[PDB]
Amino acid sequence: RTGLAEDGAKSVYERLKNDRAPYETRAQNCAQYTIPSLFPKDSDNASTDYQTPWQAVGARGLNNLASKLMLALFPMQTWMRLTISEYEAKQLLSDPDGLAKVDEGLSMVERIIMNYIESNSYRVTLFEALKQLVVAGNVLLYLPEPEGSNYNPMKLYRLSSYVVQRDAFGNVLQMVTRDQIAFGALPEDIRKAVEGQGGEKKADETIDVYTHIYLDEDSGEYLRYEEVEGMEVQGSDGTYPKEACPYIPIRMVRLDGESYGRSYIEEYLGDLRSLENLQEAIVKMSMISSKVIGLVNPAGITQPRRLTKAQTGDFVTGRPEDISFLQLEKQADFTVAKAVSDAIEARLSFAFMLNSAVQRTGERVTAEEIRYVASELEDTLGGVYSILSQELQLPLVRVLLKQLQATQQIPELPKEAVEPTISGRGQDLDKLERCVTAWAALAPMRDDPDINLAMIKLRIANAIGIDTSGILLTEEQKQQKMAQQSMQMGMDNGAAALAQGMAAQATASPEAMAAAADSVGLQPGI
Amino acid sequence: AVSDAIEARLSFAFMLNSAVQRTGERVTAEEIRYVASELEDTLGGVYS
Amino acid sequence: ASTDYQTPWQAVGARGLNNLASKLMLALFPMQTWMRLTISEYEAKQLLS
Amino acid sequence: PKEACPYIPIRMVRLDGESYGRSYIEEYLGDLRSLENLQEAIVKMSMIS
Amino acid sequence: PKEACPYIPIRMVRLDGESYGRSYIEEYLGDLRSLENLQEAIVKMSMIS
């Protein structure tokens, strides 16, 4: 292999491993103050015990932020829509009816995409990825090629399992993932290379498998291969388009000239560290005050020998003044520490969008003030997931669209369909529903002889901004509706008139009365 | 005070409804609804 | 990539910047159409009947 | 089959490279121990009183 | 064209005779510095306490 892949997948992984080390260090520091097990250190193993952080806002705001991001980015309602360019489409077909049929097909496609997302537990993996992005700012999502309708969950790579190199322009030049798969669990093609390499390995032996995705010099495309023991696996070679690469590296906070992203917790790690210091001291002061020490005055006359051997209700020589208890006298410092603890925890709660900010530490709270400031949390919600639509949502749809077309799970796209991820169809619903409410107001003036109601309906629809093609009935369709309406009375009046006359002839005479019987199969004599 | 403070944050982590009940003082029904929504949202995190 | 950004001692600046940028975004680029194409009414009427 | 094994091992909190999962309680066991210490001392004080 | 250049340099606060704009934050940076000083001292007093 030439270009970026000359050295090999494993060696590229080690050279870029040192570059990602500062991000791993920050992720471990960020995890330490929120949820230590979220980003464990490399040396951590089954015997590692993760201490509970001295303060709670870090873990609490971490869980809150990931769920709120998940709700906004991946709600139950469709969060992507397939959009066809309105002018280019109308240039290819001749009637608005087909254009609605085009939107029906696009609506079906995104229904299939969501059904595929739910049936493959993408929401489970996305929430794990979102938690990683808040503490580490980095996660790699791999979407395996779907084999039929089988369960195909996407693989999540933590920052410690992959490296990505990115130029200052922001292009992913190359990226290597490390998979530690047992010999038994290896796929056949990877296993054949391991046996082909030499040696007899136990089924439980761990194999380092490296997948190297690098930008090709020719065509500006991504070349992909899997390497084991420094040897490329036969059949692991492949090609992915630049915009449809299944390995998606997501950055929570992106800085120019940096290959990896920054985490959200890192922006507030200073507050968490200082709140950790205050919270630890406050709890440790309570541990001191928890100890009971009876201070006996040696200038006094009370003997603990008599006190401890006494029963309840016993009369004993002594004075209450000679017996005292060691107490922690730090209330002035305790109030200062608690005040700054509350002050930092309050602003950390707002930064983590915790509803303690609306709840406040104390005093009375009114409902209406909460709603307006709740909007502020929903507004600052917009800023935190803003690049996640471009970093995560949009490539996720692009890879899925190409993969589902390859497996024919969706029909082949017209090649002119664009997909925006909008928290779309709901916007068109609001426009349509406003038109009906505006139009329903025109019903009082239905019989008005002065105002051109058709003209007003067009202006109302146009001012809303909806596409007006086909909403107004054409002259031919108006003629058909009148004809269909006229036929309805024509058929209905005819059916009543015909049956009445037919009944009259059937009952005209007893002789014809028998004729009706023999016709239907009845018999006069019974 | 520290026992009430630790029990308060443990109550929120365990989805306990005493968290919205608070240590003391008066509460408002509409405010209780919003903070109870936060508990149900963080609830979704643990069974994901 | 090795630079550590210390959290500012006050939080209003980070809170203020995020709120301002978000509030500007809703005002300038909302979900509703924020630009309109307008044709000069007299000039258009001088061209169509 | 790999996908339809009747024996289902469930992990509450799964960590990379671990055969078993972590519990949810152990993330807050530190606060539980500290509250345990306070609650024991508070009750034992009442027993002296 | 002079009116349709794809490179758009945007200035938040425009001053006459200046090639670049001023930030909106710098209008209030003095109050941010003063509050930074107070917030640093308040936290550090708590650390002493």
| Cβ–Cβ under 8 Å, residues A157 and A139 | yes
What does each C-alpha distance from D49 to A205, A297, D46 come to in angstroms? 63, 20, 5
Q: Is D30 exposed, middle or buried (0-12, 13-18, 19+ CB in 10 A)?
A: middle
- The C-alpha atoms of residue B47 and residue B45 are separated, in whole angstroms, by 6
CB atoms within 10 A of CB A75: 10
Contact of A75 with A127, CB cutoff 8 Å:
no
Distance between CA A203 and CA A194 in Å, rounded?
12
Q: Which residues of B are less than 8 Å from A131 in CB distance? A: 45
Contact predicate A458/A468, CB 8 Å: yes
Task: Spell out the SS3 assignment of A52-86.
Answer: CCCCCHHHHHHHHHHHHHHHHHCCCCCCECCEECH
Integer Cα distance of A229 and A315 in angstroms: 85
A170-173 long-range contacts (CB < 8 A, ≥24 apart) are A170/A254, A170/A256, A171/A215, A172/A215, A172/A245, A172/A249, A173/A4, A173/A214, A173/A215
Do A141 and A159 touch, CB atoms closer than 8 A? no
Look-up: residue for tokens 């005055």? A297
Q: Do chains B and C touch (3 or more CB pairs under 8 A)?
A: no
Phi/psi at A26 (nearest 5 deg)?
-65, -40
Angstrom CA distances, C20 to A315, A380, A416, C25, E2, stand at 73, 9, 37, 8, 31
Please check whether residue C8 touches E, CB under 8 A: yes
Residues of C in contact with A376 (CB under 8 A): 19
- CB-nearest to A365 from B3, B6, B28 is B28
User: Does residue A139 contact residue A175 with C-beta atoms inside 8 Å?
Assistant: no
Sign of CA dihedral D36, D42, D43, D48: positive
Q: Nearest-CA neighbor of A389 among A436, A360, A422? A: A422
In whole angstroms, what is the distance from residue A44 CA to residue A53 CA?
17
Interface test with C, best of A350, A387, A389, A427 (most C CBs within 10 A): A350
Q: How far apart are CA A409 and CA A412, in angstroms?
A: 9
Phi, psi of A494 (to 5 degrees): -65, -40
Residue C11 C-alpha, separation from nearest chain A C-alpha, in angstroms: 7
Q: Which chains touch D (3 or more CB pairs under 8 A)?
A: A, B
* Distance from the Cα of residue B9 to its chain's centroid: 8
Q: List, in sequence order, every residue forming a beta bridge with A490; answer none if it has no partner.
A: none
Structure tokens given for E40:
């640093």
**CA-based nearest distance D32→chain B, Å:** 8
- Which residues, in sequence order, are bridge partners of residue A212? A176, A225
Ramachandran class of A230: left when φ > 0, alpha when ψ lies in -120 to 50, beta otherwise: left
Say if CB A421 and CB A394 are below 8 A apart: yes
Contact residues on chain A for B9, CB-CB shorter than 8 A: 56, 60
Structure tokens at A83: 């959009």
Q: Residue A151 and residue A146: Cα distance in Å, rounded? A: 8
Judged by CB atoms closer than 8 Å, whether chains meet at D35 and B6 is answered as: yes
What CA–CA distance (Å, rounded) separates A296 from A319? 11
Concatenate the DSSP letters of all residues of A157-208 into one string. E-GGGEEEEE-TT--EEEEEEEEEEETTTS-HHHHHHHHHH-S---TT-EEE
Of D18, D30, D45, the CB nearest to A51: D30
Q: Which of A104, A101, A106, A100 is nearest to A83 (CA)?
A: A106
Closest CA to D34 of B8, A343, B17, A293: B8
CA distance A259 to A249: 10
Q: How far apart are alpha carbons A495 and A304 in whole angstroms?
A: 114
Note whether A37 contacts D3, CB cutoff 8 Å. Answer: no
Option in C10, C16, C17 nearest E36 (CB): C10
Are A163 and A249 in contact by the 8 Å Cβ rule? The answer is no
Report helix, strand or coil for A140.
strand
- Quick check: A137 and A260 in contact, CB under 8 A? yes
A363 DSSP 8-state letter:
S
Taking CA atoms, E12 is separated from A382, C23, D20, E21, in Å, by 21, 15, 54, 6
Q: Are A376 and C15 in contact (CB under 8 A)?
A: no
Count of H-run helices and E-run strands, chain A: 17, 13
Instruction: Give residues after which chain B gaps, C-N over 2.5 angstroms.
Output: none
Contact A364 B25 (CB under 8 A): yes
Interface contact flag, A465 C33, Cβ < 8 Å: yes
State the method: cryo-EM
Q: Which chain D positions have a beta carbon within 8 Å of A158's beta carbon?
A: 16
Q: Is E43 on the interface with C (CB under 8 A)?
A: yes
Q: Which residues of chain B neighbour A128 with C-beta distances below 8 Å? A: 48
> Could you give the strand order of the β-sheet that contains A247-251, starting from the edge strand earlier in sequence?
A155-157, A138-142, A247-251
Classify residue A176 as exposed, middle or buried by CB count within 10 Å of its CB (0-12, 13-18, 19+).
buried
What whole-number distance in Å separates Cα of residue A63 and Cα of residue A11? 37
This structure's resolution (angstroms)?
2.7
What CA–CA distances, in Å, run from A424 to A126, A419, A427, A492, C31?
Answer: 22, 10, 5, 45, 9
The amino acid present at C10, given as its one-letter code, is Q
Burial C3-41, CB ≥16 within 10 A → b, else e: eeeebbbbbbbbeeebbeebeeeeeeeeeeeeeeeeeee
Q: Is B40 in CB contact (< 8 Å) with chain A?
A: no
Q: Give the span between the Cα atoms of A502 and B25, in whole angstroms.
A: 85
- What is the pairing mode between strands A247-251 and A294-296? unpaired
Spacing of C-alpha A240 from chain mean position: 25
Dihedral sign of CA atoms A170, A171, A173, A175 in order: positive
Question: Taking the C-alpha atoms of B23, B29, B34 and B39 in order, what is their torsion angle to the nearest 10 degrees?
Answer: 50
* Euclidean distance between CA atoms D32 and A478, whole angstroms: 76
Q: What is the phi/psi pair of residue A175, to 5°?
A: -165, 135
How far apart CA E34 and CA E29 sit, in angstroms, is 9
